[PDB]
Paper text:
The pyruvate dehydrogenase complex (PDC) catalyzes the further formation of acetyl-coenzyme A (acetyl-CoA) from pyruvate, enabling the tricarboxylic acid cycle that sustains oxidative phosphorylation. The PDC is a multienzyme complex consisting of three components: E1, E2, and E3. E2 then covalently links this acetyl group to CoA through its catalytic domain. Without exception, the PDC is organized by non-covalent recruitment of E1 and E3 to a large core built from E2 catalytic domains.
In order to characterize the fungal PDC, we purified intact complexes from N. crassa mitochondria and reconstructed its native structure from single-particle cryo-EM data. This showed a dodecahedron-shaped core with icosahedral symmetry, composed of 60 E2 core-forming domains decorated with many flexibly tethered enzymes surrounding it. While this alone did not aid the interpretation of the interior density for any such sub-symmetry, 3D classification coupled with the application of tetrahedral symmetry yielded a correctly averaged reconstruction symmetry, evidenced by a protein-like density and consistent background in the complementary interior volume. The first class has four interior, threefold symmetric densities, each immediately interior to an E2 trimer. The only observable points of contact with the E2 core are in the twofold interface bridges connecting the density-associated E2 trimer to each of its three neighbors. E2 here provides a predominantly hydrophobic pocket, composed of the C-terminal residues that form the bridge and helix 2 (H2E2). The segment of the interior density that binds to the E2 bridge pocket comprises a small (approximately seven residues) alpha-helical segment, here referred to as the binding helix (BH). The backbone and direction of the BH could be traced from our reconstructions, but the resolution did not permit assignment of its primary sequence. The cryo-EM reconstruction of the N. crassa PDC core exhibits strict icosahedral symmetry, but with an additional protein PX that forms a tetrahedral assembly interior to the core under optimal conditions. Two distinct tetrahedral configurations could be identified and refined to  ~4 Å resolution.
Author numbering:
A (entry chain OA), B (entry chain M), C (entry chain KA), D (entry chain L): 230 to 458
């Protein structure tokens, strides 16, 4: 079968990414037992005006982490580092045509409802093939999601240039966790975990900086109430 | 110590692989408690006519998944995608001379006993150094195994070109899993888990396609009776 | 009523068969209590993608037995024995026009789902009268089924030339079987049996060979897990 | 594969048999629970001087039945019926070369030990290929045995000409049988049965005659003590 030609550009782009920018990976585990309760409560206290998912919370947390650590929200240009202020998030969508990356603008201080609405709009518009180039050309940070497929415990991705980082969220799973009952003995409790994998560019970011970013993300998620901050 | 010269070719090949094809990894966890029982029962209901292993089941499942999702069983050629129909599986063997990749032909609809016989034959012939080039030059998909070494929980490998994907199977381990007793309380059950890592080329395959392939593999393994299908 | 003319050809064919080839019969009893459980479980673990019967398992077992004993998969030609390698299976279908024998190709190493799909397609095409001559001219081995009729315990058939053997599968029935309880006393267990009748041509096959073939068939059925092998 | 030529003669012989002689079959069920006890006791009350089987008892019973009903021990010749007085028994042996029928002479009034010795000698001489034509050319009645194969419940055979009848003995099996305990209630007893199939030529013998022969056989077996008579 001959190549469609469109895949050629994507292959060249990815080749540029891997050959220009080295890649190192960080892998952590989050706890979402409180996040799911929060999502359920907000969904129930509603009149069909909105519907939430895990990706939106993750996007808000990404924005907060980027603002607390601006070095990640950066890039690599001609002998100069370009540093933004806001957070432009590229969300991946898997069409039968292939892959596409619409963008959400001004995440930090936008609202989860607006986020979900914009993501639904862009996803349906990509399934229809009705996008503009500016809506998927740009962005400082990216994300790919596979939570629907329960088999994937974890996976890596490739950094869509000229960006510096990219995230990946596996499926949820059941894990054993210790717990202290009212007496001195320990007990078993079942916590819902997710694995998260972040690939970074080493020219800009160091292992310590990436670890700090991941720590802030884990903290914000495990304490969802700090999303207000 | 000067270089043997043979290692030069493998180095150049791996360099071509990583520089021509970008790599992204997927990591999942399988449950094999039923698979091991099946292997035990089939080994018992025999008269020394055969002996099975986990790799053979894995190879059969790879064939089934490749047939259900043919995009993986592909390659990258001069401005064209070559898509096969059958599944040619490259199995790795670690000789004192290094690494070698014999091939099994027409896996789908071949039989586990024939598979085991062919694998044993090729492995002993590789230990003796009695192979032909056609036997290890080709193949659409590959695999490497390290189950004998119990310490390796997981590992990655490199795509032997011109193929598109490669698999890797860690060791088995003991993991906690919830279970519902006959009453309403949950309990602790010890299941035998294996980590599996799949490296894909991003020019041909996308994340959704890889996830679908892994899902089918997990389903087939967890329900071994579907191997008949 | 004058004769349709089509029956003339079938009469001459059967006359040639009985006058050229002597017939001897072998009658055995199988146990399918495990087979039916397997079929029920595979049907339950599905999404309507397929639906299985007993004839398909029987056909797979026929292929396995033919491969373990290739002398059965034979014929008689002009001063020469033609021996095949693959198993082409002629399945009988009872149309209002009469009897017809479509063929399934390459049974050994094909898969039960594909077998069922091909059989359904051929059966509907025969009910419609839309077949080619090649699809029902050939085959090394044949079979006739009457399982829908619960009255028939056993029955013989006639060897469709130039083949050497043919099968016949009666209905299931309830039979008494001894069983040892946990104590030393025996008990009564109700097993679901089927009678099977195989007609052979004596020029090619002998009683010992037919008995060996039937033993392998009984073994593979009573241990359905060996269908993988 | 071209034909060995030896099979040509056997094919022509069997063709002559089926085209000259019509075949009808009679199928019955025996009870051997006492016979096996008798065999075990006679084997235990010995010094390794002999070793018995079931076929020898069967051959003695065949001789007794043939003498009680001489019409079976007959043939068909040129406008004349040739009737013998003694019973010459053709026993089948399955060599890798094919099938062969050595003969035992003067069965009636010979003794089971002598019968077993002669059968062992003839069987080993047939496995070695050291026979004379007279030793397997003749005989008034024939038999084939498949008791070693537990899968075969019943089977037919073909009349070796110019004889008029032939026997066939399946495997033993477990069957449910009623039994009256000391009280008025019935109970379940497990008896060891064998199916027996006798093929007859219809020119000489009729259904009533065959039934009488089978009745006498069943009687002598079920009451083994009448073997003395």
């Amino acid at each position: 079968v001959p190549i469609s030609g469109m895949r050629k550009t994507i292959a060249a782009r990815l080749k540029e990414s891997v050959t220009e920018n080295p890649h190192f990976f960080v892998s952590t585990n989050l706890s979402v037992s409180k996040l799911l309760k929060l999502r359920q409560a907000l969904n129930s206290s509603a009149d069909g005006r909105y519907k939430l998912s895990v990706n939106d919370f993750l996007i808000k947390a990404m924005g907060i982490a980027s603002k607390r650590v601006p070095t990640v929200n950066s890039s690599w240009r001609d002998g100069v580092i370009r540093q933004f202020e806001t957070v432009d998030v590229s969300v991946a969508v898997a069409t039968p045509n292939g892959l596409i990356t619409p963008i959400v603008k001004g995440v930090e201080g936008k609202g989860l409802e607006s986020i979900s609405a914009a993501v639904k709009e862009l996803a349906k518009k990509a399934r229809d093939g009705k996008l503009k180039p500016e809506e998927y050309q740009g962005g400082s940070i990216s994300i790919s999601n596979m939570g629907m497929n329960p088999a994937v415990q974890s996976f890596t991705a490739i950094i869509n240039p000229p960006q510096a980082a990219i995230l990946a969220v596996g499926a949820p799973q059941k894990v054993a966790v210790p717990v202290e009952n009212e007496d001195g003995t320990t007990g078993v409790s079942w916590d819902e975990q997710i694995i998260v994998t972040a690939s970074f560019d080493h020219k800009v970011v160091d292992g310590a900086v990436g670890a700090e970013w991941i720590r802030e993300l884990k903290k914000v998620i495990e304490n969802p109430l700090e999303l207000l901050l």
